[PDB]
Amino acid sequence: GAMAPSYRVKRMDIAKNDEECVVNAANPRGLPGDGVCKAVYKKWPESFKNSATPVGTAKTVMCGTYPVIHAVGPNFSNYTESEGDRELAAAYREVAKEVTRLGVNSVAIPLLSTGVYSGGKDRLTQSLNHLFTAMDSTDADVVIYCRDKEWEKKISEAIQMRT
């Protein structure tokens, strides 16, 4: 575990992370995809061998010794708000199981279902609160990656508001 487990947020490409493992915002079919998934595919393409996994689950594939945790958030275009909310919470619980199993002291994590799986809605708070619900019982340092300047501010505020 980390001596004093923390949450941080950085606004940059998660492919450039400084953590012991990464969470991919994956699709269920293990395809290169778009956004974070495409960045992950470019950086760690070896980790897409048999990475397909259902919605609401996480599947870890090693790129060398570097773990890539493929977490499949729901596409809110396809799910009802109720069912999508349940699957989004479930994907994060599976990330927390994998982070724990791996014994890492840090993890880089994007906000699941906030980009092209958002169904055109702002899901920062929904996705971040499911992240916290799952990750709060873990002792890894968590570094959340985002690209938008206003999202960085809002994630940073949410982290600071609970310290």
Ligand X SMILES: COCC(=O)Nc1ccc(O)cc1
101, 121, 139, 157: which one binds ligand X (CB under 6 A): 101
Which entry of ligand X, Cl ion, none binds 8, CB below 5 to 8 A by partner kind?
Answer: none
Residue 85 marked as a ligand binder = no
Residues of the shown chain interacting with Cl ion in the complex, contacts defined by CB under 5 A: 12-13, 115, 117, 146-148, 151
E strand intervals along the chain: 7-11, 22-25, 58-63, 66-71, 106-110, 141-146
Confirm whether residue 66 is marked as ligand binding.
Answer: no
- Consult the annotation and say whether 117 binds a ligand: yes
59 binds ligand X (CB under 6 A): no
Can you tell me the distance from the alpha carbon of 88 to that of 132, in angstroms, rounded to the nearest whole number? 12
Q: How many alpha carbons lie under 13 Å from residue 131 in its C-beta half-sphere?
A: 28
What burial class does residue 146 get, using C-beta atoms within 10 Å of its C-beta: 0-12 exposed, 13-18 middle, 19+ buried?
A: buried
Choices 89-97, 100-108, 123-131, 138-146 (CB under 6 A): range interacting with ligand X: 100-108
Name the phi and psi angles at 17, rounded to 5. -65, 160
Q: Determine if 61 is a binding residue for ligand X (CB under 6 A).
A: no
* Footprint of ligand X (CB under 6 A): 20-21, 65, 67, 101-104
